[PDB]
Structure formats: C-alpha cells, structure tokens
Ligand binder design. Structure first.
Ligand SMILES: *[C@H]1O[C@H](CO)[C@@H](O[C@@H]2O[C@H](CO)[C@@H](O)[C@H](O)[C@H]2NC(C)=O)[C@H](O)[C@H]1NC(C)=O
Ligand SMILES: *[C@H]1O[C@H](CO)[C@@H](O)[C@H](O)[C@H]1NC(C)=O
Lengths: 165, 163, 170
C-alpha cells in the first residue's frame, strides 16, 4: 500500500472502488473507531499515570552548607536524567508501536477482502484488487459487508481468467 | 478469528472440528507450551531483575533541621514518583505485548494449517477452513499431527467446487 | 535446501533477508537489498537512540561528611542506592524488551518477503510449507528475477502451469 487517501475524509482506514457506475471512497467505521479509541487511550494513560505531589524546590542553604547544597544538586540532576531518558525512550517506543498498529489494521482489512475474492479477482500487489467480473455498487458493498457471494460470480470470473489465452 | 473456546480446557491454542461423525476441541500442545514458557519468563524477568538493597527509611531530623528533612522528603517523593510511573507503564505496555503475542501465535497456528491443505480447503474468514472433501476423524488428526496427506484427497477436492 | 521456517542460510553471506533459487541453469542465493538495508538502518537507529538519549552532567560523587554527620551520609546513601536501583532495572528491562522487539522485527520482515512471493505465484507454484515454492512451469533466470522484482507475469505461464497441475493422478 503506497500511501494514504487525501480524498478519504470520513475515517482512518477504508476502501476505494471504481466501476462502470463511477468511483468513490468509503471508510470502514468499525476498525477506525477502535483505532481512534486505542490511540486516545494510549495518550491518556501516558498522561494520567503520572502522579505529582506538592513541593517547594528552592535553594535555601548558606555558604557554609555547600556540601548539603551539592547533595541536593546531585539529587535534582539525578531525577532530571531519569525522567528525561524514560520520557524520550517511552515516546520513541510507543511511536514505533502506534505506527505498526496502523500497519496491522490496514493489513487485516486487506486480508478480509482477499479471503472473499479468492480467484475472482487479481491481487495487483499495491493494496488493490482487479475484478475478473463486473462488480456493481451492490457487489462492492457486499465486499465491505463481508457478505460477498463468491459462487455467484465464479463462472463469469473463470471465463475472463482463461480468456487471456 | 473472533472469540475463545470455553469448551477447550487442555491448552491455550487449538482446534475445533465438525464432520459427519460429530464435533469437538483439541489443543495444540507444542505452541501452547512455548507460550506458557514465554509468559512465565516475562513475569519472572520483571520480578528477578529488581535488586533491593538494605536501607533504613526513618525520620531522624529535629525541629531546627527542617530544610534537611524537606530535602529527604523531595527525595522519597521523587523515587515514589519514578517507580510508580515506571511500574504502571511497564504493566500497561507488557500487557499489550502479551495479548498481541497470543494473537500472533494463533495466526502462526492458522498458517501451519493453511500451508498443509492448499486447494483442498476453502478459507473462511473466522479462522475456519471448509473442506472440499470428506475429512473424517483420522483425517482431522493428521491435520493436527502436521502430516496431512495432501495428494491423497487432492483429486476429490477439484470436484466439489464446480458442483 | 530448506526455507525460512527451518533455520537460516549459512550460504547467504550477501545480506540479511533474501532468496535461494534452483533451476536448469543452476542455483544460488540472492539477498533482497532493499529490506536488508532498511533493517540495518532501523537496528542501527535503535542502538543509537538508546545511547544518544542519555543526558549526563558533571558531578563529584565523593563522601565528605564527618563522624557526627552520619544521618546526612545515610541520606546520601539512600539516594545513591536509589538511583542505582532505578537505572539497573530500567537498563535491564529496556534491553530485554527491545531485544524481543528486534527479533520479532526480523521475523516480520521474512514473512513479508514470503507473502510478496506467494501473492504473485498463485496456483502457478506449490507452497511446499517450508518457505519454498515449487514451480509448475519452467522458471529461468529472467523469470526468477521478476519474482524478486515484483513484476512476475502470472498469465504468461498460467496455461503451462495448469497442464502440469493434473499429472500425479494421471
Ligand atoms: C450489505 O450489502 C449487500 C449487497 O449485496 C446488501 O444486500 C443487498 O441489498 C439490496 C438492497 O438493499 C437488495 O436488493 C438485496 O437483498 C441484496 N443484494 C443482493 C444481490 O443479494 C445488504 O443489505 C447490506 N447489508 C445490510 C446490513 O443491509
Ligand atoms: C497421527 O495421526 C494419524 C491419523 O491421521 C495417524 O495415522 C498417525 O499414526 C499419527 N502420526 C504418527 C507419526 O504416529
């Protein structure tokens, strides 16, 4: 799958079809909503799990108390280093996960289509299927539904498949 | 592949079949054991990698040493915040991974079956294969064994499709 | 000669992921250079971010409290021990976690390479079930290249493939 549909506005993952009647985009609302809910939950947990207490970070040691002030410096610097590393790596790690999540969702959508069409359509290798029969707007809907009737078009599909000969 | 078998008790991942003789569950013991070993290892590493040394957390500063007591408070609170966040996020993260691990294992089990019976089965979308030939209890066992004899049923298979 | 799902090619010195073919003209290994380079770049980036994101400042860790300042020395001990525990756990778990991810990454890349082939050679070749495809037609060195390219012309060999598909029976 090469890139994304700027023309598809209504969702995150979906379909594009073209036939004799015309062409258009249609979003898969189920998988889109699950993905939006998951990603929102990810961002929220990363925010909500932080538990911050009250504190008064202010330096109140005198010039004959510099060993204690240094002890405080080591501590403040220590926590800055811990949080910086953990925050940075958490972001890098969860970003990798989020992008793979989207990849995984598109693939599942592609396989749900593939397993219906079998040899009634040619996998073009770019996320698109070329049909071996005439697939109208009702036929296209059934492919999104998960109700595509394979035997109904299988004969017609078999003629055009060996018509290449 | 939607939903788990309450009827399948003997393992974690497995098979359900239905034929003329009846229907029933059977667990895949190889992939189940790998999954149990991995998950147990995950829990153990999360426990074992912690090293807690001895210490005496006790407050022993007087009423003219409150700046030092506050310094200790900032420290104790600091570590409580670090451990709380890391523990919480570690759990949430590894739980996501554990559930995807199971998903991944089921898919591998499904592919092992798919590659063993090419044109002999009709892939449905729910993790299920509809056979194009009559597959009895012996035939079903061989699919679990990993020694399903494809050529033996291959001819019969090409007939039910055009019926 | 096996496939991916029963070990690696010691004979493929070329790259990380790739192909092995055998036909009448001969046999050999061929690395997929695109996916190999992406994997090397990703893994190198992983190692570099894990190193580069660390931010270390100057400090003079030395114990300079006297024998009537042991409560303060203990406060320092709790702190030093605290950070040692935090870094140890995080470092250990980061390594274990990212190693799992790295190995699954490689697994995933090999599977993608296998599927790109499978979806081209539909019923023109037999999935042997060990990462290898047995062709039902004569596939020469140009034919093999096209399978790696992603340009394999299925209709061109489909008829020949259908003739041989019905032999074992009669
Ligand atoms: C999913 O789309 C399918 C497309 O086949 C719908 O079924 C068709 O509906 C049309 C008009 O609504 C009817 O003429 C037929 O009953 C169906 N067509 C065929 C060829 O059988 C189906 O209604 C859609 N899903 C839902 C839940 O409505
Ligand atoms: C596995 O089950 C089959 C039944 O199809 C049986 O014939 C065979 O003996 C079993 N395999 C082995 C190696 O014993």
């Amino acid at each position: 799958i090469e890139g994304g549909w700027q023309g598809m506005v209504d969702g995150w993952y979906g379909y594009h079809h073209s036939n004799e009647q015309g062409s258009g985009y249609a979003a898969d609302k189920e998988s889109t909503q699950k993905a939006i809910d998951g990603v929102t939950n990810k961002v929220n947990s990363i925010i909500d799990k932080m538990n911050t207490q009250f504190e008064a970070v202010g330096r109140e040691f005198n010039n004959l108390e510099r060993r204690i002030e240094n002890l405080n410096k080591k501590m403040e610097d220590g926590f800055l280093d811990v949080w910086t590393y953990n925050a940075e790596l958490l972001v890098l790690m969860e970003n990798e996960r989020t992008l793979d999540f989207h990849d995984s969702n598109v693939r599942n959508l592609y396989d749900k289509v593939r397993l219906q069409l079998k040899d009634n359509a040619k996998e073009l290798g770019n996320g698109c299927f070329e049909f071996y029969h005439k697939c109208d707007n009702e036929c296209m809907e059934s492919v999104r539904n998960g109700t595509y009737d394979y035997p109904q078009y299988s004969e017609e599909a078999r003629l055009k498949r060996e018509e290449i000969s």
